[PDB]
Amino acid sequence: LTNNVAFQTVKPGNFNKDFYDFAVSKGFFKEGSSVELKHFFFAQDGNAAISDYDYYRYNLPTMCDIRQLLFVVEVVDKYFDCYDGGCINANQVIVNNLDKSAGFPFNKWGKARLYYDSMSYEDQDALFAYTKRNVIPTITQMNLKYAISAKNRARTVAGVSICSTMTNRQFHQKLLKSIAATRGATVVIGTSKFYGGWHNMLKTVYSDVENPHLMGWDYPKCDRAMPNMLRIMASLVLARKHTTCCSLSHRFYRLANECAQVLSEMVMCGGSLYVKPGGTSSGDATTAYANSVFNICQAVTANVNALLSTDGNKIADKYVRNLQHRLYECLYRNRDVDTDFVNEFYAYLRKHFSMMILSDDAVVCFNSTYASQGLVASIKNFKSVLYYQNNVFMSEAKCWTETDLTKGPHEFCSQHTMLVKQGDDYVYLPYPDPSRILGAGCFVDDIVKTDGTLMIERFVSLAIDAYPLTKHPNQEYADVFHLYLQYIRKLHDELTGHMLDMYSVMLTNDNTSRYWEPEFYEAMYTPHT
Amino acid sequence: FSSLPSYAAFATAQEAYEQAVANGDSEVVLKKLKKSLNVAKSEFDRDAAMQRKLEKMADQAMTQMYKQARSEDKRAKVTSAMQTMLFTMLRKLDNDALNNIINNARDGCVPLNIIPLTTAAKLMVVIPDYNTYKNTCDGTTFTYASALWEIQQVVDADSKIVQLSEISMDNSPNLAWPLIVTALRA
Amino acid sequence: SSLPSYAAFATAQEAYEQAVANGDSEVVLKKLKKSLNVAKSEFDRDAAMQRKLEKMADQAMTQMYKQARSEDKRAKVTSAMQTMLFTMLRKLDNDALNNIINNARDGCVPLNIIPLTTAAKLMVVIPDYNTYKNTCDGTTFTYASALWEIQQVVDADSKIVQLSEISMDNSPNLAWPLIVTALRA
Amino acid sequence: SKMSDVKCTSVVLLSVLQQLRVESSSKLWAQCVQLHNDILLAKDTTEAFEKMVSLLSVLLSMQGAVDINKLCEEM
Amino acid sequence: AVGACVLCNSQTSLRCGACIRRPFLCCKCCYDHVISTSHKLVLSVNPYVCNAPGCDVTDVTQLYLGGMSYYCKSHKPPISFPLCANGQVFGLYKNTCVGSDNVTDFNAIATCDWTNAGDYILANTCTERLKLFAAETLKATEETFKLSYGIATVREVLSDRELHLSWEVGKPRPPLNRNYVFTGYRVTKNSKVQIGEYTFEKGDYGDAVVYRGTTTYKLNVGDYFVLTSHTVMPLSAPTLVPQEHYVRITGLYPTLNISDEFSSNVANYQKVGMQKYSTLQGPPGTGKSHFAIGLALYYPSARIVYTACSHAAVDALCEKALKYLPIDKCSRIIPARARVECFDKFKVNSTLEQYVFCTVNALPETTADIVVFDEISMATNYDLSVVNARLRAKHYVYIGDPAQLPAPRTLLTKGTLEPEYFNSVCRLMKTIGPDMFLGTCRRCPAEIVDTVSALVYDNKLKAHKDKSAQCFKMFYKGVITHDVSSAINRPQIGVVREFLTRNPAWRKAVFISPYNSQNAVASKILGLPTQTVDSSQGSEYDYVIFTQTTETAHSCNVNRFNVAITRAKVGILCIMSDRDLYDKLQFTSL
RNA sequence: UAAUAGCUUCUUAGGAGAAUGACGUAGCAUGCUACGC
RNA sequence: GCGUAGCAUGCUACGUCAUUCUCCUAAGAAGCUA
Ligand SMILES: Nc1ncnc2c1ncn2[C@@H]1O[C@H](COP(=O)(O)OP(=O)(O)O)[C@@H](O)[C@H]1O
Ligand SMILES: [Mg+2]
Ligand SMILES: [Zn+2]
Ligand SMILES: [Zn+2]
Ligand SMILES: [Zn+2]
Ligand SMILES: [Zn+2]
């Protein structure tokens, strides 16, 4: 568009010298330490956005197996059968934050609040109904992220404009907020890790598994290597709740709008319009949920491949040999749905391959005996499935397997979990990486966050997040919580000193006394509230 | 509240109470006048408490209406900005070649990716290193998209002018790559 | 609590406590308890709305401090965090950085980035004969606690100059300052 | 504590360089961010230290943006 | 917002209200300022007026603070305390406060009106911060009083984004400045009160102005806007950098066998070299404007920025560098105003070159290696603070002579100013003496220089020239018509009319007069190139027709007579009216 | 230039509900008193 | 024995206020995860 190509860089982080000096005065950051700074604010040159958009070259046009995908679709829909959804009017769509951006070219005149206030409900419903029989191509910006991370590559997020976002919210928000309000299901979205929510999720994982073993894989380049077919499938599975509100042509045109606004459309990279070959833009209205559908698809496809690729004469259980026979005849010998066998296979999967999904992170409590025999998906099955349906290689180096159920999964949502004693029983508490917490404390992304005395909520929230480290067997893992607590104590003391010097009156209700004693953080992980 | 006639009733009842205190009348008269004072209090306190929430809701509706008016005035401004942007981009259009390629079409529909490929009068090549410069736009004229373009300007990543004799094999490290050459259709 | 309605409550306290110290009976006791309760309530009201006054002032003061310190933190930071960089740099106490910025103090600043690979070009300006005497001995050039050999000595006249004439009695004859080109050994 | 000590000095030095608008020169900003990201990902004391020397040399070449003499007598 | 106190530099938030510049002021310092002077308004983060629906009690010693508001004696709350108690004014940072005795001079600085000639003396002997504050409020008061304003009223309200303007014809109009303010003057019956503080930037279409106001009140039909008060930039740098003495040459690189002309001043270039700032004093036409180029050719590798308060001095310096310095990279800086013609033969507007030519009000915020401030006689403390805040160099050079003219100072109409009280540099060079010196006249002939070597200097200045004997002294009435409040003398230009036909060697002469009106009208009468005494300082003139018009304290000063007569390098004709000044000159008597 | 979704902490404002206490009005019951029947 | 009036006590309904708690919404600040 403009006459010169714009180059955008990323500034480095801002050092909080007070916090680091307090840390090194408390015996931290030595040699021989198990805890040193590993999450920093990495900076980038002017070739960051263009060299990160180039990673879409890993997205190849992938032709998925169709006689098997048309059954994995049924299994995924059975996984998504508890929820309800449909279309909602413009006066029922609720936005979380109105000050967020509105993409291109709507960022030139204001934020999203301008377009949610200038447009009434009537012409919002008019636009939504227009999209149900029309296609609106859309430009999506690529925004460089200014955030803390453990590796130096620039991460980018795709900024979808408001014209696609409002219609997608009106289409999907009922189902998206029904998923985020159900507890004990496969897709754990909307479930907190506080107030014993982690323990509840982790005990709903362990629901009827025979000889339990824990497994978790990783998708390399998850959002950039996905085939267009799996994204279209996810958009169709999320659109299977509109069997009453929407007609067939309306649903097809909504799918077309999703593909024209999300999957393969023009991408803005520094004042220049390119073409997105495919894969999900990670900033649209349905990204965590569609990615969860994709992850469940890959798991079910791995299970089907593992079950079919087994010999058949070595099959000890005589039922499951018949189940494999029926699986093959329902894959490659039937053209209509066999709902009885779909129910049976879904029950088999929920019985032997219990799962827990948040959009690319899965913790599975698969049967160990069946996996050793080869009747449920294992690591190598997922590797093969990602090789021939995702065009990426899944190495074992970052995918774990836990053989002891008393220590939980190795890593879920970047939170290590462990078994502790609370009260009279035992619960699981997720503890983060202390390097991450120390890096967040030391490296702020602004100047007003460096002073400290202005922001006590930052360190209170960090102490809330890093409380479970005290129950860890390693001592200097546990010392992080006390470091943050003494830092809050000193911060409050010097804030009171400064506000005693800049006035003559000391605050009558200084309510901070509970932030530096462990009851406020201990009550955070108790299942009463 | 303080302007209501029930305040006048309460005030005259209280004046009667203080006048009877100054008079020192009988207990029955004082009790009756106290009953009158208490019912006046019961009326006026209730009415004032009703009016307080009334002022609250009046302020709330006032604020909502004020916000809605400002929203309308912002809507007009963004509408004007969008109209001006659209009409300026119309003034930027190259109507002759666009009309030619649209009239060549059957339905009148053409893919969007070929509109600049056949009607744009100015082209920009972004060149990461020297070998690609030697391979795509060597010299002062080059051929892309089945047309002939003449290089009018070469700028580096810092938007500084680079003369075409500056781009050599040995002089490549001294240039701030990438190079953005600008060419016009001939 | 230093209020006139507090005085009304305190005299109700004294009067009805004295009445209980008598405590015989009965009607004056109940009526005086009624008066004590009404004084309690009318004091309680303005005490609570006084709560509201000091907490409204808590908005006033907390907003006040946050906004002031906001561009208090903005205005200082650039020069102030340069000072932070130098204090914390000096805390390292590495002889290479010490040597380099003590040479920078005298005016011996490099004209380009110092290369790290072996046998790569560095050009640094020499501002004094004493600075040359300390760092260059023979054809060698010590800098950043590293060994460099000389390709250029060259002056402000851009005249090709050779290595021997830089001496005690020939130093004023030079066109100062001199620019050296060196490689890393 | 000598190792976690350089890794913050690189951050503050790059922030100072960004303050003095090295960002407007893409070529220089290239090895500025290069050395910054490499020092953050360092294992030994040495390469961290002469990469520190190379990154500080960017601030060294700068005559008028810094004034070297004030920021080092009172400290 | 918070700030620092003026006379003690302590943290504070109490602005004074009736001071002209609206400065920041302390607690005890503000108590002493408002308890001894007529200034009674004080601006905290909120104004200290009473908070009754109708009440105007703006004095601070007079109110009470109850709750969170300011109330008067009549409207006081039962629980409160007065603001001015225990010797302080209520404000932020109450007990982190320290006072001083600088209020004895601060009260006189903030109280005076700057038309006397003793407050100017007070504004140059006190401490540095009070010097800066006095100069700042001098500039503010000058901008308030001189060339004040024209009345403007608003006809109708188009919108709150664009305004209507109507200047009153008969008075001029000041232009856009956010530093300028037009105070609201709905003065009718009916609230002759400040309704706000406004500035006006004009539009490109129709009769409209897109204003910027600091109030939330709509305009009345009778509301007016006359420019009272102005805000100048609050500079921070001192008038003079503190002196530091060196031993050897630092930051500079000398040359051997520099040239033939500058060989006499080589020891001078050293003594410039090992001092932080050095001062040069010399009678006019001795080479002060030549010493800068001598410094340039003695220190070749170093950048030097050459700057003066006016444009004529920097242009003469341009000329001398044009003949002696390399033409290839030399610079010249013109402002964005571009009001007047400049020396456009080098690169105009190139701040990154080794020899930068500029004027004090238009310097860029860059570095240097030597700075040479020319003709401090045109420099006030404001200009010195400007060049100190904007230019940041190893060496400062201050060249000039106090015997030449000081700054205009149009407020100064009573009393006399000594040369040592023009600014801080003059106070240095006249009290403790200049560092180094030259006196020898090579510009005006021996006759006229012998005349002036008794009036301003008592016989410390000789010449190396002849008495060419065309310094004609004439004494006539020259009837004075007082037209434009600037003197016009038609019979004076008439005796000059008819004394030019008799002299064939004076057809190249230049007309000089201390009054701009007669000066300008002399253009069509007799056709010679025409210059005033103020703007002709610096350039050398072959033949000069000086014409003293009136008898007063304005044109009869010996200093302006000195500069007007000493610019005639070979001959001059002087017209006159005085008798004390005619008694001491040694001219041909006619 | 700064995306979507989820969770959590803190601060304010408003509403609703619950609980406790206090004052006032109305209704019912018990005891006592004045007078009349 | 009945009525009217008055006082004391208990209970219920309503009005108001104070205190505490919960929730629902709005706004603002922050942290973490995908
Ligand atoms: N040493 C010298 N030898 C010859 N001529 C000189 C010498 N010094 C100065 N001059 C001449 O005298 C003139 C002095 O001009 P200027 O510097 O404006 O004097 P001032 O600054 O003292 O008023 C110059 O034009 C120069 O040509
Ligand atoms: Mg001169
Ligand atoms: Zn629908
Ligand atoms: Zn004052
Ligand atoms: Zn003070
Ligand atoms: Zn008042």
List keywords for this structure.
part of a larger assembly, 5 chains, B: 186 residues, Alpha-Beta Plaits, four-stranded antiparallel sheet, rod-shaped, D: mainly alpha, 3 helices, 64% helix, 0% strand, globular, binds adenosine-5'-diphosphate, binds magnesium ion, binds zinc ion, RNA-binding
Structural summary, described in words:
The structure is cut from a larger assembly and holds 1 copy of chain A (529 residues), 2 copies of chain B, 1 copy of chain D (75 residues) and 1 copy of chain E (590 residues). Chain A is 41% helix and 9% strand. Chain A has 18 helices and 12 strands. In chain A, a hairpin with a 4-residue loop joins strand 5 (266-268) and strand 6 (273-275). With 186 residues, chain B is of the alpha+beta class. Chain B has a domain at 99-185: Alpha-Beta Plaits (2-Layer Sandwich). Chain B has helices spanning 5-23, 27-91, 95-104, 115-119, 130-136; strands spanning 122-127, 141-144, 147-155, 179-185. Chain B has a 4-stranded antiparallel sheet with strand order 1-4-3-2, covered by helices on one side. In chain B, a hairpin with a 2-residue loop joins strand 2 and strand 3. In chain B, helix 1 packs antiparallel against helix 2. Helix content of chain D is 64%, strand content 0%. The longest helix of chain D is centred in the first third of the chain and has 17 residues, at 3-19. Chain E has a domain at 446-575: P-loop containing nucleotide triphosphate hydrolases (Rossmann fold), CATH 3.40.50.300. In chain E, the strands form 9 sheets. In chain E, strands 18-15-19-20-14-21 form a 6-stranded parallel sheet, sandwiched between helices. In chain E, strands 22-28-27-25-26 form a 5-stranded parallel sheet, covered by helices on one side. A 4-stranded antiparallel sheet of chain E has the order 12-11-10-13, with no helix packed on it. Chain E is globular. The termini of chain E are far apart. The complex binds adenosine-5'-diphosphate, magnesium ion and zinc ion (ZN) (4 copies). Magnesium ion binds at residues 288-289, 538 of chain E. The structure holds a RNA duplex (37 and 34 nucleotides). Chain E: Residues 257-438 form the (+)RNA virus helicase ATP-binding domain. Chain E: Residues 439-590 form the (+)RNA virus helicase C-terminal domain. Chain E: It catalyses: ATP + H2O = ADP + phosphate + H(+).
